[PDB]
Structure formats: structure tokens, C-alpha cells
Amino acid sequence: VSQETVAHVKDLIGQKEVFVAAKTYCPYCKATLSTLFQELNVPKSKALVLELDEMSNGSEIQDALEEISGQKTVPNVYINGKHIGGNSDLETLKKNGKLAEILKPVFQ
């Protein structure tokens, strides 16, 4: 895991307000994307969703994410540069109202 790749991934995380690292065949990723973009209607134009299994540098990005967030699995969600976690973490925030609050500056 090179520092160059790590720096690049931090760049990607900050490009859009909502960042999601996922894999196309993962049900946890599907639930997270559904929650954010279908149920909550977060504008897709304010999000960068990486499907690592369809990225030539997917494994390198995932390794960089582990270094940056300590997380080893997908989905890996960031909102406004802050690490949110995975699908279960998203569900907890959704239920206690904190997800709606942190997405306030994003919704439009």
C-alpha cells in the first residue's frame, strides 16, 4: 500500500460529499446504495460510488481504504470526508435520526 495510492484515495473521498466504496455483487452494498439513493434520495450528482470489482485498481483502493479507515469490508461510506462505516452502521444512523442530520447540507 503506497503513500501515493493512499493520497489518491483521500482525494477521491473528498471529491464528492457522499463517497461509497462497493462491489457490484455485494448485498450489503446494494442495501446501502438503496438506502442512500432510492429511499433517502440523496442526489447522485453529489456522490462518488466506486464499484471496486469494476475498477482496474480496485484491490489497491480497498487496501488504501483499510489504511485510511481501518475497515476491511465494503460498503465503506464517507459523508463530507468523515468515515461512516458499513451498512449496519448506516442502519443505526438512519434509525436514530443522525443520518438525516449529517445529510442536511447534502440534500437539495
Side-chain angles (χ1 to χ4, degrees):
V1 195
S2 69
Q3 52 177 29
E4 281 68 37
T5 301
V6 173
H8 175 57
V9 172
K10 292 213 162 186
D11 178 356
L12 297 181
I13 289 173
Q15 282 179 13
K16 293 298 176 66
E17 292 154 85
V18 180
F19 173 91
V20 174
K23 288 184 183 180
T24 68
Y25 52 78
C26 178
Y28 302 103
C29 291
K30 287 169 190 48
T32 278
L33 295 175
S34 180
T35 289
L36 293 167
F37 305 116
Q38 271 133 70
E39 176 176 12
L40 296 175
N41 294 297
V42 167
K44 300 190 87 76
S45 52
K46 295 189 184 187
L48 173 61
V49 178
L50 303 185
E51 289 297 351
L52 305 183
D53 56 309
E54 297 184 330
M55 296 282 283
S56 298
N57 55 169
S59 65
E60 290 87 341
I61 291 177
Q62 188 164 3
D63 286 341
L65 281 169
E66 189 182 345
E67 158 110 343
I68 298 167
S69 72
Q71 189 173 317
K72 307 185 188 69
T73 60
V74 289
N76 199 335
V77 181
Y78 274 75
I79 294 180
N80 279 316
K82 303 183 183 304
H83 185 221
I84 300 302
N87 192 61
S88 58
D89 295 306
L90 198 65
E91 287 289 312
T92 294
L93 294 179
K94 180 166 68 179
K95 296 180 179 181
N96 64 22
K98 292 180 61 180
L99 182 55
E101 288 292 341
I102 64 175
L103 283 170
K104 275 192 63 183
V106 180
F107 289 131
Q108 195 175 341

